[PDB]
RNA sequence: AAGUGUUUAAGGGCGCAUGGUGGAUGCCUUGGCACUGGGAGCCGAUGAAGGACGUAGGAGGCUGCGAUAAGCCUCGGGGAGCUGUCAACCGAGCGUUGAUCCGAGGAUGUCCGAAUGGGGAAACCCGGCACGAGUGAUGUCGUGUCACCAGGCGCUGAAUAUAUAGGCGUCUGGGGGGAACGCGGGGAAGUGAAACAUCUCAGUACCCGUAGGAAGAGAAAACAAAAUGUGAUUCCGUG
RNA sequence: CUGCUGUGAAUCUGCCGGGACCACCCGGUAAGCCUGAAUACUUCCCAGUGACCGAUAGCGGAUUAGUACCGUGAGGGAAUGGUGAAAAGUACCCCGGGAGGGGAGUGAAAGAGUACCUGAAACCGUGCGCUUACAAUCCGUCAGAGCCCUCGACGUGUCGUGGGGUGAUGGCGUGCCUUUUGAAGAAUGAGCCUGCGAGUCAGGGACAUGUCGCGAGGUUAACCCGGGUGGGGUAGCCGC
RNA sequence: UCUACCCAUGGCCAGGGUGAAGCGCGGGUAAGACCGCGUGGAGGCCCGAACCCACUUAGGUUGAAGACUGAGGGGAUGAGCUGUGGGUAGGGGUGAAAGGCCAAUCAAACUCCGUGAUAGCUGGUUCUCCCCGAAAUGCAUUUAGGUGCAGCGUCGCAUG
RNA sequence: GGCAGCCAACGUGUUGGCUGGGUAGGGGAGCGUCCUGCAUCCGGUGAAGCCGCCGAGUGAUCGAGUGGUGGAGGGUGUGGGAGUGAGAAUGCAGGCAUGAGUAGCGAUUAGGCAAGUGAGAACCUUGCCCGCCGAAAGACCAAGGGUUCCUGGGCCAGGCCAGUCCGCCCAGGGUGAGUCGGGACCUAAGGCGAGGCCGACAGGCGUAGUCGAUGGACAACGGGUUGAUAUUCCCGUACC
RNA sequence: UACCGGGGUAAGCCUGUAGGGAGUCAGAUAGGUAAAUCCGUCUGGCAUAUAUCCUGAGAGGUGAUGCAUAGCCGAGUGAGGCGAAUUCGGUGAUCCUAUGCUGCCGAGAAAAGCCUCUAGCGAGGACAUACACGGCCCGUACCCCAAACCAACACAGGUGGUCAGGUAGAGAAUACUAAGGCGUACGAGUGAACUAUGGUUAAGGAACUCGGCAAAAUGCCCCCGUAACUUCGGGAGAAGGGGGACCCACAUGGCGUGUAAGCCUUUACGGCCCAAGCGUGAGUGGGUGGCACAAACCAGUGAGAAGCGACUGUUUACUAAAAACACAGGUCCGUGCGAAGUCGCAAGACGAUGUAUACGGACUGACGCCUGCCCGGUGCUGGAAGGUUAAGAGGACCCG
RNA sequence: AAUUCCUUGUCGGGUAAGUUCCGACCUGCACGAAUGGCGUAACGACUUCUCAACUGUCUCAACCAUAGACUCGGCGAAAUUGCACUACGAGUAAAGAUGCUCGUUACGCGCGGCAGGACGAAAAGACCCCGGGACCUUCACUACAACUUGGUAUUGGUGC
RNA sequence: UGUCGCUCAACGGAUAAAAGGUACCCCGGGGAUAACAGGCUGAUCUUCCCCAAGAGUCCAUAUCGACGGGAUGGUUUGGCACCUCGAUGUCGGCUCGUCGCAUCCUGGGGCUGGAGCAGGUCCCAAGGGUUGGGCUGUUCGCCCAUUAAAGCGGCACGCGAGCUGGGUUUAGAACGUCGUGAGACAGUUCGGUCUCUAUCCGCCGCGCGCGUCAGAAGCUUGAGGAAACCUGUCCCUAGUACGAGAGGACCGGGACGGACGAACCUCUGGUAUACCAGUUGUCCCACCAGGGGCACGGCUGGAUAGCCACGUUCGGACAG
């Protein structure tokens, strides 16, 4: 009995590692913000 | 007496007649796809591309707009109906003294975003200075302005003498985004070779730096072959 | 021609090219810069076209679509169009708690009722006819009794150049596909229906073979001029 | 955000045993060594809940559950367990070392792209009829279930 | 007695002789589908599609032969062009069978009766009993969730049965702080990082700084009140 | 006389008890990136006091004529009014004094804040009382061991912290139970087989089986009594055995606590003693009852010997927990210091704010007795007399 | 012997009976000294053998209760599936037949049960072979990083 | 033009240039190809036979039968590679069986180098029976007590959609050995997931329907099936037959058992969830007394009926 699932939430852990604002900090993550954008992605980061 | 002999359908099968389910088929379309001829080929610190939150007399989505919030002003068009739409229903109003609507130019344009007063988990937290408003005063509220770097111009010139590095002040720029096309750099592998390393795939995919409306190239230290030759570059057809 | 690392000249008798190199001729004048047109492309805007698609097609997206939903994230990523000309969308009555239905209305039609054009098949019912509980069945086929229905002529049913439905009973009879020397095979694949799903296209390409034009000649490429599919264009190419 | 290890900062460990060093006193001695009796409360110490494990067994095995449940079992002041916040990333990480683990996937994660990768291999390839109609041999082969040429089919032309 | 291929014989297409099992495979000739140039014809006096009847051809198949359904296009001839034919790929999408009215309906506590509500009650409400947890199955939080909370209404989806009930559906309402938990205070690990150093470019590190609680500092307690908030509102008494 | 329910009330502000912690004044100084009356350091004088001061549980007073409450009125929508007593003891924390104290080795954040010192500001300024005022932003509903979070489900799994009633009991175990909360969402029947989960069993007692797998057994407290061997700690709860209930007496006893009275004094939040009252074992003697006195639940099986590993630990999340890994201990090799090693293209970083008694790598693996022979092969270390050997130099001779 | 092939070696012990176990012998297929040798108190959910106690493990099984199973009401799946009014024997066949031959047996339809067959279901056999991958090794090949040699540039002066 | 340079010898000559491991394994394929079972074959194996050289004092043939020869069977090891690699799970044990006779016991016989008892060998016979333990994963085998006897084989070496999982044969680890190494060993050692709700046939049970020439009811015949079928010891006959003695019967009678099966519950014994009693802890019924709830039916001592075996009774014939 560990049933300990991979899904544990955390909302600041998820924007440091997601959110915007590190998504930006370099070129591949603003690339990536590019990408979904040009998707047409309502949500373009966590 | 012996012998012959129909006569059940619990249920099932097959055929037909009537239905259900389902959404094929036929015929369509407010949507796509491939192209042709034009236009425009950039937008951004005067804050972009794209967003968050708000905004109509009534809940939400799409659309429009930004606390002046389905809108404000001006110049033109237009001519009887309108208050975007899903979407009506109710409740109120405007318009021949020209509404709704269409085109052009202005005004307003919260917050986030290069994001740039400082900070931050984008759209939310906290300030300096100047002017104004408001308080009995503190608190509070408007409106400007305050990142960093590069390059002009002015002042100053450490250790230290000459000086210089640097430090103040001020003006002018840059930053980010965009489907393809350009130029200059970096540069695979699957694969082919019926194995594989040279070689191929391929200077392809991808990546980095920069453009422009196109770019690059361009005005012979060129070709040619004895012809009394051609005469910048680019691009197309041949060879 | 050009990068990096060394070395390192001449100013016209100079120097650099003419596929190692040398000579002779020829061409040119490096180590400075700028330069339009012919060429490439279309996020976006305007006007059009199609021997293009027509809702499992066409964009992933005709429907809140990059939405719902999935993933921590990069990222992945659907499904859902048609009433009728007009909403005239069924007042009112009846059964029912509703749902739903039956009368009555509207409509050309409700065999068009917001579950809606047409409404196939699988699949699921009800009714009628024949058949089936002593029988061993790849499920059918060829003979065939009996019953039911129908078309002719005759008469009360009975026969025919008949036609259908069902079928007691007799003979014969080992699914389909793939793949194998050989499979009913106890080898593989298929639960069922509907829809979709595989030799296509480009190039004066190559060889062959039809066909058409011209013929010792045939033909143009780019390009130019026509709102076209037409005219022009000799560079080439292939024969000789 | 699972898991491995590390960094910073917090929390948690019922109850009951055992009795190290040190200290004190009394024996003993010339002084000691040494020996009793207290005090003391040490330890990857003992028994045992929470908590952390997963040894044996039965059940589950289209589960209640993509690893669990019942019954017993081990550790339980320590190389302990745990919260919060943080760090290391793919030929790389981390590993008290099982090639373990790195989001139910690991002898090289996942996603998109090259990309419709390549398969001498397996499967599939859809209407009809008319005429003809094989081969499973020879040679060679990084060849033996592949392929080239020959042999054997067909269509056309020629020769009869 | 019908059909076909090859060949012969003559004729302005008939007669005769021979031949016609067939996988891989070669050759020939056709059927059905869609889109089109041209020419013709049918169609609200009812096109296509679909379901039948009665018939037809050597086959793919046909019916400008006819009923029913249906509601707007279709046929034919001759040419041009194909997303042109499925039964099978453990093929794909949708619909639906078989297993089958079968297995299950998710613990280790357990329900019973009376009365009420209601169309309907084993499951809803109230009362009286019974039973279970009680280092929890009680009470209060962080994380996470996001209106699930309260009142009124609802009962065709959801709830593994039913349902008048619901954590489900609908409308309205509800969250009040100088002292609580955070910011405006402080730093840890770590992150970012003006200049800077390093690195072809992309970038890698890092100084001054500036962020970053799980820690440091810092002022409120008891009582009452709403259907739903309370160290927040109110009362009493405090503190910064 | 028996029984049931009450037998309550915070922060703050007074007061400064138990406990803990402290010497003070004077002279000199540029060590504290300038200065200092502060701090540090050095020299002198005066101190061992229940002296003085700081700190601090709690008792007591106030807060409180208030608030709250057992009950009682009527009256039911459930709101409203009235409202007694409130003493003394015992027991007792895992909470407080306590960031204390004592012990130990592994030697145990930072910054703000607060205090103080000058530098530097200064003509105005400090303190007290009264009155009138400002005190921003975010969270605050509800669930939160769960059908509201992580689990595709109204899923037997998972989820950190804070409260801890009573009787048995060592206990937060376990049994029953209070407050409070549930009966949790398919049911009703029915003696089939069979499966699962519990229960009992004549006689026998491992004959079962790969194997005592699974069950059964042992189990608590207080006494008695315990071997080989040993590293002298252990082994050890070794083994083996006896007692345990209830009533009465000893007992108006013993022990803990401690009021009245009394005694002492530094008279106060003092000290000594203490009948009563309350609580509480242990033992001894006699009796009484049962099949059974650890009464249920709870709760070691023990012994002899061998292999491996010394030991406590660690490991294949999801078939292996071990003899594998680790380990303390050992030896070798490297490393003289932005060391060696490692990460990185570099800068830089770790190693280490370490310096050979250190750090890295390798093999071995507590401890005891020990660890022989071989340097031919292949590595590693050192050497360079020979053989061979790159680019760079040279440039004979030859060829166009 | 965790090492011994022959091998259940041989002798002794334990048992009524001992291929395992304990003590020895040495004929060590094929122990041996930090891939340490031989021992070792304590320790072990390790592995092995023996004994006491205890028992449904067994001789040998019986009975009780509860949850399913079963019946009634409600809701309502799944894997599988070319067909179907799906007997047996002895044969025959791709050599193991419900489906072919000859014969035998058998009224139609269900319910509760058992698992011999349907080469039952699940999963394009993990074994083996053929073709292709991957990762690992090394005195296989060829490269590259890193390290290292000399020349030359940065790089100079005076002396021997 | 002439000629030279290749153990390119894997010699039609993939590169000028190349070895291994995988039990950590993965994918595409094959029953084109092995390991299990089936099938063919039958060398080997097995069972029997033909000839009779000899052995047996003499005497081939009571009993053995050399050298050679001919076959059966198909359970051994093989040979072959025909079904199955889009799956036919293995040894041993357990449970349940079913068939053959080449018969272990019991039954019936011939011949004996059969006096008797007890045997040897061959023929006929398959109804029933054919034990429990020690060692080993074992099959096999050896051993210990018994027995009338402790038969040999087939059925996928019967039976894992019935159970087990000790051996073997995944991944961990270790020893010896081999390999420079990764690793390897029909060498050894310790450890290591055994899934499935039964549609069809088949089998065990139980109903519904219809039929058997009207609708019903009681009692029946038995075509045809199924079950059952074992055996010992002791005492008489008899210490007789036979025999030197030792020893010791056939045939025919009687009693008492083992194992197995059936029915049954009077007895003995087991069980007992609404029986009675005792008793611990706790909570409750205000309280005492008396009771109840919960703790395995709390625990403990008993316990009629039912069910049951360890119990009771009966069976296997007798005759044709
Ligand atoms: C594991 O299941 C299957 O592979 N199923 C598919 C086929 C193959 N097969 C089978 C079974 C076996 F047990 C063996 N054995 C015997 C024991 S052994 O001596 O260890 C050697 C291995 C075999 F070779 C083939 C079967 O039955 O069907
Ligand atoms: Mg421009
Ligand atoms: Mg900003
Ligand atoms: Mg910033
Ligand atoms: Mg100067
Ligand atoms: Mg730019
Ligand atoms: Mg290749
Ligand atoms: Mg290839
Ligand atoms: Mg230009
Ligand atoms: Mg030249
Ligand atoms: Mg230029
Ligand atoms: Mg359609
Ligand atoms: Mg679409
Ligand atoms: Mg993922
Ligand atoms: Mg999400
Ligand atoms: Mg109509
Ligand atoms: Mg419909
Ligand atoms: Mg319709
Ligand atoms: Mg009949
Ligand atoms: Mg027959
Ligand atoms: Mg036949
Ligand atoms: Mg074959
Ligand atoms: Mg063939
Ligand atoms: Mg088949
Ligand atoms: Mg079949
Ligand atoms: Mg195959
Ligand atoms: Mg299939
Ligand atoms: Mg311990
Ligand atoms: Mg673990
Ligand atoms: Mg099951
Ligand atoms: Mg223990
Ligand atoms: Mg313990
Ligand atoms: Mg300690
Ligand atoms: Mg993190
Ligand atoms: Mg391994
Ligand atoms: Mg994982
Ligand atoms: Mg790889
Ligand atoms: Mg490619
Ligand atoms: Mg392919
Ligand atoms: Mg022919
Ligand atoms: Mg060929
Ligand atoms: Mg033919
Ligand atoms: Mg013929
Ligand atoms: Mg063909
Ligand atoms: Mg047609
Ligand atoms: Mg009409
Ligand atoms: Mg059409
Ligand atoms: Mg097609
Ligand atoms: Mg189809
Ligand atoms: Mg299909
Ligand atoms: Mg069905
Ligand atoms: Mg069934
Ligand atoms: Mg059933
Ligand atoms: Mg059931
Ligand atoms: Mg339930
Ligand atoms: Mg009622
Ligand atoms: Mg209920
Ligand atoms: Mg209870
Ligand atoms: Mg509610
Ligand atoms: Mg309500
Ligand atoms: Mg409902
Ligand atoms: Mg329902
Ligand atoms: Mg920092
Ligand atoms: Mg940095
Ligand atoms: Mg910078
Ligand atoms: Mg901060
Ligand atoms: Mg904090
Ligand atoms: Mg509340
Ligand atoms: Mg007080
Ligand atoms: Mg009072
Ligand atoms: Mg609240
Ligand atoms: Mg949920
Ligand atoms: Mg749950
Ligand atoms: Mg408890
Ligand atoms: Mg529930
Ligand atoms: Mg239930
Ligand atoms: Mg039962
Ligand atoms: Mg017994
Ligand atoms: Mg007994
Ligand atoms: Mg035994
Ligand atoms: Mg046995
Ligand atoms: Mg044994
Ligand atoms: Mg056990
Ligand atoms: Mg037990
Ligand atoms: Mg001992
Ligand atoms: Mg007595
Ligand atoms: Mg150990
Ligand atoms: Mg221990
Ligand atoms: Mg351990
Ligand atoms: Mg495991
Ligand atoms: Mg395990
Ligand atoms: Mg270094
Ligand atoms: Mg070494
Ligand atoms: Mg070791
Ligand atoms: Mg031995
Ligand atoms: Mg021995
Ligand atoms: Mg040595
Ligand atoms: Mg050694
Ligand atoms: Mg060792
Ligand atoms: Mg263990
Ligand atoms: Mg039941
Ligand atoms: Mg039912
Ligand atoms: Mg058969
Ligand atoms: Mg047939
Ligand atoms: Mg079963
Ligand atoms: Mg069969
Ligand atoms: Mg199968
Ligand atoms: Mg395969
Ligand atoms: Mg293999
Ligand atoms: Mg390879
Ligand atoms: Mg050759
Ligand atoms: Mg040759
Ligand atoms: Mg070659
Ligand atoms: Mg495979
Ligand atoms: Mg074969
Ligand atoms: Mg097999
Ligand atoms: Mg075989
Ligand atoms: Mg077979
Ligand atoms: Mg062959
Ligand atoms: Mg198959
Ligand atoms: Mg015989
Ligand atoms: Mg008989
Ligand atoms: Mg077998
Ligand atoms: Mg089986
Ligand atoms: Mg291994
Ligand atoms: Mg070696
Ligand atoms: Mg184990
Ligand atoms: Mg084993
Ligand atoms: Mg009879
Ligand atoms: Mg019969
Ligand atoms: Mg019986
Ligand atoms: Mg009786
Ligand atoms: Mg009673
Ligand atoms: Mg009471
Ligand atoms: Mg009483
Ligand atoms: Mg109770
Ligand atoms: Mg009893
Ligand atoms: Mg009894």
């Given at each position: 009995?560990?049933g ?11 924007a ?16 990536i ?11 373009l980061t966590?």
């Amino acid at each position: 009995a560990k049933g300990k699932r991979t899904f544990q939430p955390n909302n600041r852990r998820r924007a440091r590692v997601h959110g915007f604002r590190l998504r930006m900090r370099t070129r591949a993550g603003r690339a990536i913000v590019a990408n979904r954008r040009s998707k047409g992605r309502r949500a373009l980061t966590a």
